Each structure stands twice: as C-alpha cells, then as structure tokens.
C-alpha cells in the first residue's frame, strides 16, 4: 500500500501501462490524483497501473441492472427520475434517468397513461438500457410485472398499499389511486 501524488512518476512504459488517473510523459508515467495506486496484472504479465480516490471509488449501472429512482417531473411523453440505489448500494452522485411512454409495461400497449402509472414524488425501480451521450440520460424501462412503483404517498400525506396491478389504496381512508404497481 502506498498513497501517491499528482506529480510523482510511477514506472516506465516498459514496466506498466496507464489504466486511469494517470498520464504519460517521455518514457515515464505520472500520477494525476491524491490517492492509492494499484498495478493489476493480466495473464499477459504486463501490468496496468492505476490510481484511485476510494472515497467514491467507482460505480456503473449496466444495461441488465435493477435501479431505484424517484419520480420528480412527468409529461404525457416521459417521466424523469433521479438515481438513488443502484441495486442496494446508494450513490450520492445521483444520476438522472428517464422513463418513456411505451416503455412502461410488458404489453407495450399505447393505451398506457403516465398520470395513471406514475406520479411526482414516488419511488420506483426499473431497468436501464441506454447510458446516454451528452447528458448521460439513463433511459429506464418497466416492461415487467414485478417492476415500477413500490411505495407511494396518498393524496396528501398517507402511504398506500399495492392492492392490484393498476390500483393502490391508503389504509386509513378509502380511495383507489392508479399506478403501474409492481409485483
């Protein structure tokens, strides 16, 4: 174990290659961060050196993921969300995703309707597909019956229970709201 510094060299190119958090100058590699270095080794025997600030080391929500999020804004077209838990490990770097209109139910019917599936201020979980290019807009999908809304607060302040596929109700009083209930 050794902590490095944004100026110190680490190794010749003949003794390693830059993986991340580094750069190269004439016949040498040079760190670029205050953190811990590590030289991994492939079966090829040529090491890959890298430097990491393990405070928030790295996370990556891949395609076949299951990520929770919070519904902030909505429209007849799409509903935007914020990423909180990628699996079960939270990430203070809250990424921002989107859910399309048709990409809401496995049946893919156009009859779907956002205001009857989602509402602003409720938590869902979905599957990412596209990372995005400019703003890294994750596009999430809920084309599955064990997906979508899990917790949802009532008209004003009550938490409801998922009775059926597109129904939810508050336990104190009685009122049938409409969502894309999960499971």
């Amino acid at each position: 174990v050794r902590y490095c510094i944004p100026g110190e060299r680490l190794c010749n190119l003949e003794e390693g290659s830059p993986g991340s958090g580094t750069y190269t100058r004439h016949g040498y590699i040079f760190s670029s961060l205050a953190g811990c270095l590590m030289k991994s080794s492939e079966n090829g025997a040529l090491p890959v050196v890298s430097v990491v600030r393990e405070t928030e080391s790295q996370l990556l929500p891949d395609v076949g993921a299951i990520v929770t999020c919070k519904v902030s804004s909505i429209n007849s077209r799409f509903a935007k969300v914020h990423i909180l838990y990628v699996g079960s490990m939270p990430l203070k770097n809250s990424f921002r995703g989107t859910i399309r209109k048709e990409d809401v139910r496995a049946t893919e019917k156009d009859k779907v309707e956002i205001y009857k599936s989602f509402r602003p201020g409720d938590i869902v979980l979905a599957k990412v597909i596209s990372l995005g290019d400019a703003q890294s807009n994750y596009l999430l999908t809920t084309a599955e019956n064990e997906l979508g809304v899990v917790v949802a607060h009532s008209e004003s302040g009550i938490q409801m229970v998922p009775i059926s596929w597109c129904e939810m109700q508050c336990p104190k009083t009685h009122t049938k709201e409409f969502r894309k209930v999960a499971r």
């Binding site: 902590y3 510094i5 944004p6 100026g7 110190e8 060299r9 958090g21 750069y23 100058r25 040079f30 670029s32 961060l33 205050a34 953190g35 811990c36 600030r53 393990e54 405070t55």
Partner: protein, 252 residues
C-alpha cells in the same frame, strides 16, 4: 449606502495614521530562509475538497465546490474567488473590494489552469474559493499552494502540484533578495515578486512582480531563488496530502 448590509458610518479611518512613532524595523536575517509551514488538507466537511495553510502570520483557507454543469469548446473551466477577510491587514476594507482581489484572482486562475487538466472535466466549472484570514507576508503564493492542495484533495486530475513563493528587495545600499518575507519586510520594501511553478516538470505556471526599481540580472536571481524555495517547500505539501488520504482510509 449599501442596502444589503448593516447601516454603519459613512467613513472611518484607523488610529495608526494618527500615531506618532517610527515603527520597528526587522534588521538582519538569513536571506535564504523559509518560515515554518503548517499545511493540512481535509479541514472542511461540507466541501468536496478543502485545505488550510499557515506560514507565520499568514493564514489561508481554500475550498473547492466541485464540477457543476454550466475538444477545445467542451473544455472545463475553473473560476476562482480570492477574498481577504476584512479583519486582515492594518486597515479595514469593506468585503467587496474591486481593486486587488480581482487581480490576485486572475493570478490564481492563470497559475492553476496549467496544472489542472480540464479535458477530463468538460461542460463543468470548478468553483475555487480562497480566503485570507490573516496577512503576514507572501499571500498570493500561500493562496496558490492552498488551492492546489484543495484541488488535489477533492480529487480533480492534474499534471503536477503548484508551489508558490514570494520575494522582496532590501532597500539597503547593498540590496539583497529577501525570501519569504513578512508584512513589515514587505511594506518597507522596494520591489516584490512572486513565483509559482510545478516542480516535477520544472515549469513556471504563473508569476508576478513589481518594483521601485531593479534590473534584468536582479530579477533573474530573484526568480531562480524563488524556484529553489518552492522546491524546498514541496515535501511539506506532499506529506500533508498523504496524511489526509490515510485519515480517509481510516474513516472507512
């Protein structure tokens, strides 16, 4: 009258100007000397990165509010706000300023843009915020070093660190270049200078100067002397960063 601050008096002059005495002069010392330095990174909590540096009566903070959305056009930016606390210096100045704060801000930006690599931080602006709690000599150099520490702490990428150093000129008959001076050696001075470099690749990043006088050779000797001083200072900052990283490893 400012309507965003408390109603004070129109004007207010200090008492010193009403004093009657010949203030004490420092005298003699080892020209190639450096003051004792206390540099620590990781002071502040609510900031992604922060650093604190004390050298004599000099006391400086710097914080780094990290990337905040706002090729050669999709290239990062860093905007720096230098700011001396109204309770530093013999005289008081309203918080705003508008004369030297901005000059020193330009200096910091011109000395940081090189070290920092902004290709890896596109479409983003790093808000660097320096604060001078007490002025006791070389200030802009302390600010460069503190901003460098804060950046390296927040984990922004770089090419090398930034080390500053301030010099002055003795107005004696045999004028010698005074290294890392005090506010007294600096107000009783003829010329002043400030170097800042990246010691690994040995490249200046931003310098500055001024003079009641001088000449080519003198300025050159000053430059090289400040370079040697910055070299002799680098290890302190190195150890500080290592220490902060160890404390982080300990916290988790």
């Amino acid at each position: 009258g400012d309507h965003r601050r408390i109603r004070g008096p129109e004007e207010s002059q200090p008492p010193q100007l009403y004093a009657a005495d010949e203030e004490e002069a420092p005298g003699t010392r080892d020209p190639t000397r450096l003051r004792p330095v206390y540099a620590r990174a990781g002071l502040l909590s609510q900031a992604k990165g922060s650093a604190y540096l004390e050298a004599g009566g000099t006391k400086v903070l710097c914080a780094v509010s990290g990337p905040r959305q706002a090729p050669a056009a999709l290239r990062g930016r860093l905007l720096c706000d230098f700011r001396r606390a109204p309770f530093a210096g013999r005289r008081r100045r309203a918080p705003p300023g508008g004369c030297e704060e901005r000059e020193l801000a330009l200096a910091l930006q011109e000395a940081l843009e090189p070290a920092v690599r902004l290709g890896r931080y596109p479409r983003a602006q790093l808000e660097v915020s320096a604060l001078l709690l007490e002025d006791g000599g070389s200030a802009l150099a302390a600010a460069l070093t503190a901003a460098a520490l804060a950046l390296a702490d927040a984990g922004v990428e770089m090419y090398d660190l930034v080390v500053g150093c301030g010099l002055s000129l003795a107005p004696g008959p045999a004028p010698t270049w005074l290294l890392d001076p005090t506010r007294l050696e600096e107000e009783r001075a003829a010329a002043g200078l400030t170097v800042a470099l990246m010691p690994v690749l040995n490249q200046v990043a931003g310098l500055l100067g001024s003079g009641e006088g001088g000449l080519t050779e003198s300025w050159a000797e000053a430059v090289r002397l400040g370079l040697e001083g910055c070299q002799r200072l680098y290890p302190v900052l190195q150890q500080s960063l290592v220490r902060a990283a160890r404390r982080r490893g300990a916290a988790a």
